[PDB]
Amino acid sequence: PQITLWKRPLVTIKIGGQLKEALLDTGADDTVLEEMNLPGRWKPKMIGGIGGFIKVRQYDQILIEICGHKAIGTVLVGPTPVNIIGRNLLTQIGCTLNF
Amino acid sequence: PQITLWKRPLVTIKIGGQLKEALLDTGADDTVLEEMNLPGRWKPKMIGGIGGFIKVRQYDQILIEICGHKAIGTVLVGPTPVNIIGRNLLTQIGCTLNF
Numbered sequence: 038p039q040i041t042l043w044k045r046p047l048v049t050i051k052i053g054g055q056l057k058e059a060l061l062d063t064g065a066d067d068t069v070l071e072e073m074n075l076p077g078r079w080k081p082k083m084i085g086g087i088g089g090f091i092k093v094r095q096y097d098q099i100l101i102e103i104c105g106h107k108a109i110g111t112v113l114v115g116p117t118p119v120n121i122i123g124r125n126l127l128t129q130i131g132c133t134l135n136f
Numbered sequence: 137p138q139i140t141l142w143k144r145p146l147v148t149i150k151i152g153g154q155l156k157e158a159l160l161d162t163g164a165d166d167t168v169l170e171e172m173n174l175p176g177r178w179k180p181k182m183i184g185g186i187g188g189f190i191k192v193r194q195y196d197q198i199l200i201e202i203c204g205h206k207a208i209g210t211v212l213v214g215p216t217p218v219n220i221i222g223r224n225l226l227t228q229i230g231c232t233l234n235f
């Protein structure tokens with residue numbers, strides 16, 4: 038679709054078989070989700086944002102469906118204030134900015 | 137233009153008479169710029185993201201030109217690690233997400 042920006046670009050995603058709401062975030066290199074139970078092995082990772090760095094769990098090659106588009110890639114889990122879909126997955130679903 | 141997301145969506149802006157590089161950021165409600173001494177009155181604010189909060193100065197009705205498209209709105213100034221163009225200005229230049 039075409040998504041305007043008068044409101045937050047919130048979408049439904051499906052991950053680990055459950056539905057969640059997430060923000061499409063072009064300013065994010067990486068996809069970061071709030072604390073959740075995900076199957077599979079993970080490694081500790083650190084990621085930095087506007088306020089400094091946080092500890093996350095890095096899950097590789099995870100299946101995620103974003104508004105009905107399939108992606109497979111890295112998902113970070115940790116104390117983000119909001120679930121964010123970053124560029125690593127936006128590129129897989131063919132997202133561009135246009136103006 | 138059309139901006140793909142393989143790399144950070146960095147563009148040149150003009151603000152307070154100066155040229156800067158900034159990120160087109162659909163995950164940001166508001167625009168946040170690197171420390172700059174802008175004329176005019178401001179109000180203090182705290183803004184939060186990954187890692188916590190930072191203290192900024194809120195300036196109203198600031199003109200910014202983004203790739204030659206003019207926008208007017210609120211800008212937050214402070215020690216952000218990157219210049220962020222948020223939705224308050226992206227909507228003015230007609231920016232959409234498309235996939």
Ligand SMILES: CCOP(=O)(COc1ccc(C[C@H](NC(=O)O[C@H]2CO[C@H]3OCC[C@H]32)[C@H](O)CN(CC(CC)CC)S(=O)(=O)c2ccc([C@H](C)O)cc2)cc1)OCC
Nearest residue numbers: 064065066067085086087089163164165166183184185217
């Ligand atoms: C030189 C680089 O330095 P660092 O690595 C960090 O640099 C940065 C720092 C921030 C960004 C942009 C931000 N992306 C981000 O956090 O992305 C994460 C994931 O992927 C990583 O890629 C880039 C960073 C990592 C978000 O797009 C926008 N944010 C919203 C929230 C949603 C609420 C995100 C959770 S917000 O900026 O917090 C914010 C908060 C309030 C407001 C006003 C109030 O509306 C405006 C903006 C990009 C690069 O320094 C580490 C110390």
